[PDB]
Amino acid sequence: EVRLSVPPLVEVMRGKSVILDCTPTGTHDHYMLEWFLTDRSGARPRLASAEMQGSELQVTMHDTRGRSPPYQLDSQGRLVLAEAQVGDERDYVCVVRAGAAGTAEATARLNVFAKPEATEVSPNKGTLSVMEDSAQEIATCNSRNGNPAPKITWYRNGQRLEVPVEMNPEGYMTSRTVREASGLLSLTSTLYLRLRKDDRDASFHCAAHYSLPEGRHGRLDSPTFHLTLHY
């Protein structure tokens, strides 16, 4: 009886082309292969249909959701996604119809990893003062348009500031994750610290940590800055 071999997980860098395999076994010379997407509504819009006979394949496109560039099948009926985008991060179903041998389906999850833009740091140059004892707005760090969501850390003189996101009088950081209209995820963190005399000479910077395919990671450090103080 027919059986379908589809990779459960496929990972790609944004912008890179990727192919989704669907190898049927236990079929004869003649069978059909179809690709579908899954809607949050449960419905499954058809992507493409392919009729295989010996080695001859006839493909018909049926895409109704649209893509740029367009979906396409390869000579084996594999789904080809050129220039992967976050929009492509979802489930894909392959169905094979092999007549008396049967019918089978399998799902592939495609994860698209987008490295966020260069880590941008905006120091507070307006109100910092060292006479004051409250937790002052030191700077804001932005890690835009990534996927998955980036993570931000803070440093003072090369050592990590282990400040929590909880509230407290001496130091902490905020985190705001925005889901862009595109689907991409931008992160904003602001560092808040009580300032002391020693901080007059301290240098600061932030860093974004992002996930990559095969469980790899990346890291984008922002430029280092010194504090602008007012008297």
Label each residue of the chain as H, E or C.
Answer: CCEEECCCEEEEECCCCEEECCEEECCCCEEEEEEEECCCCCCCCEEEEEEEECCEEEEEECCCCCCCCCCEECCCCCEEECCCCHHHCEEEEEEEECHHHCEEEEEEEEEEEECCCCCEEEECCCCCCCCCCCEEEEEEEEEEEEECCCEEEEEECCEECCCCCCCCCCEEECCEEEECCCCCEEEEEEEEEECCHHHHCCEEEEEEEEECHHHCEEEEECCCEECCCCC
Letter for the amino acid at 122?
A: S
- Residue 182 — φ and ψ, nearest 5°? -65, -20
The CA distance from 146 to 104, in Å, is 36
The β-bridge relationship of strands 176-179 and 18-20 is: unpaired
Report the C-alpha gap between 115 and 123 in whole angstroms: 23
Task: Report residue 7 as tokens.
Answer: 């990779």
**Residue 114 CB neighbours (<10 A):** 24
Q: Which residues contact 82 (CB under 8 A, 6 or more apart)?
A: 17, 69, 72
Whole-angstrom distance, CA of residue 106 vs CA of residue 94: 6
The CA-to-CA distance between both ends of the chain, in Å, stands at: 82
Contact in structure between 203 and 225 (CB atoms under 8 Å): yes
Q: What is the rounded distance in angstroms from the CA atom of residue 110 to the CA atom of residue 88?
A: 7
Nearest to 217 by CA among 172, 150, 137: 150
Is residue 13 within 8 Å of residue 89, measured between CB atoms? Answer: no
In this structure, CATH architecture of domain 116-231:
Sandwich (2.60)
Q: How is residue 179 written in tokens?
A: 């889901």
Report the candidate in 176, 194, 193 with the shortest Cα–Cα distance to residue 185.
176
Using CA atoms, how far apart are residues 158 and 154, in angstroms rounded to an integer?
9
CATH 3.30.1120.80 assigned to domain 1-115? The reply is no
Contact call for residues 48 and 79 (beta carbons, < 8 A): yes
- In the chain, CATH 2.60.40.10 covers 1-115, 116-231
- Give me the resolution in angstroms, 1 decimal: 2.2
Amino acid, single-letter form, for residue 47: L
Q: Peptide bond preceding 148: is omega within 30 degrees of 0, i.e. cis? A: yes
Taking only Cα atoms into account, the Rg of the chain, rounded to an integer number of angstroms, comes to 25
